[PDB]
Write a structure and sequence with these properties.
- The protein has one domain (about 1-165): 3-Layer(aba) Sandwich (Dihydrofolate Reductase, subunit A).
- It is globular and about 40 Å long.
- The chain has helices spanning about 25-35, 45-50, 80-85, 95-105; strands spanning about 1-10, 15, 40-45, 60, 75, 90-95, 110-115, 125, 135-140, 150-160.
- By secondary structure, the protein is of the alpha/beta class.
- Helices cover about 20% and strands about 30% of the residues.
- The longest helix is centred in the first third of the chain and has 11 residues, at about 25-35.
- The strands form two sheets. It has an eight-stranded mixed β-sheet with strand order 5-4-3-6-1-7-10-9, sandwiched between helices. A two-stranded antiparallel sheet has the order 2-8.
- The chain binds NADP nicotinamide-adenine-dinucleotide phosphate (NAP) and the ligand CCc1nc(N)nc(N)c1C#CCc1cccc(-c2cncnc2)c1.
- Ligand 25U binds near residues 6, 54 and 95.
- The ligand CCc1nc(N)nc(N)c1C#CCc1cccc(-c2cncnc2)c1 binds near residues 5, 6, 28, 94 and 113.
- The PDB classes it as oxidoreductase/oxidoreductase inhibitor.
- The entry lists the keywords 6, hydride shift.
- It forms a monomeric assembly.
Length: about 160
């Protein structure tokens, strides 16, 4: 299965100047817990924002150009990225906007962190129809000394039905 994991501020904001316009350590733990020992697929710009491999996970970067870091696996297409993941139960797509756009139609699961911050972005999470998705998990947290905004984790599963001809 293909899953997307993303943190979204107000108005689907996910990025600004190749960074995330917030600081939420609590989201880091949620992200690790849900990606641990799973392959992670990311766009080149997201890779550049990280700057080093994510420990515990098979790192796959999509780029039209040669790779600039031998520690991760570089691919040049969506099908290639999926091919590189091999025979695993869950592929985690971790960003950014362009990559989310391409994978959302193929995904069966969304792991979302809703952040209560009204902040400007230049990158947004792709639009999707809420009627295609079923929320199966919520977990709310107030802001604290380490996290300046309240946030809520959510998991959604894609709605299926019987194929008819
Ligand atoms: N809030 C969150 O959960 C979250 C998570 C991750 C990232 N972000 C944010 O999102 C922003 C970056 O997103 P972005 O949309 O600018 O870039 P991106 O998706 O991270 O990377 C886009 C790049 O990936 C490569 N690529 C994507 N699809 C390809 C394809 N089908 N075939 C070949 N290459 C492909 C291309 O690289 P080449 O130019 O080399 O061809 C393209 O320029 C940053 O602000 C980042 O901080 C947010
Ligand atoms: C942790 C940020 C995050 N949260 C959620 N819920 N979904 C995501 N896809 C992401 C992300 C991301 C890309 C990214 C960009 C910059 C740094 C890191 C990072 C991840 N884990 C440890 N250190 C840095 C990760």
């Amino acid at each position: 299965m293909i899953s997307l994991i993303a943190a979204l501020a107000v108005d689907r904001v996910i990025g600004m100047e190749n960074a995330m316009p917030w600081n939420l350590p609590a989201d880091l733990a949620w992200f690790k817990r849900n990606t641990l020992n799973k392959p992670v697929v990311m766009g080149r710009l997201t890779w550049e924002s990280i700057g080093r491999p994510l420990p515990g996970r098979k790192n796959i970067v999509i780029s039209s150009k040669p790779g600039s870091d031998d520690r991760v696996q570089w691919v040049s297409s969506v099908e290639e990225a999926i091919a590189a993941c091999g025979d695993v139960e869950e592929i985690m797509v971790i960003g950014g906007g362009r990559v989310y756009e391409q994978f959302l139609p193929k995904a069966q699961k969304l792991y979302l962190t809703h952040i209560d911050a009204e902040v400007e972005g230049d990158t947004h999470f792709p639009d999707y129809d809420p009627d295609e998705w079923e929320s199966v998990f919520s977990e709310f947290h107030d802001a604290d000394a380490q996290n300046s905004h309240s946030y809520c984790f959510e998991i959604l599963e894609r709605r299926h039905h019987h194929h008819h001809h």
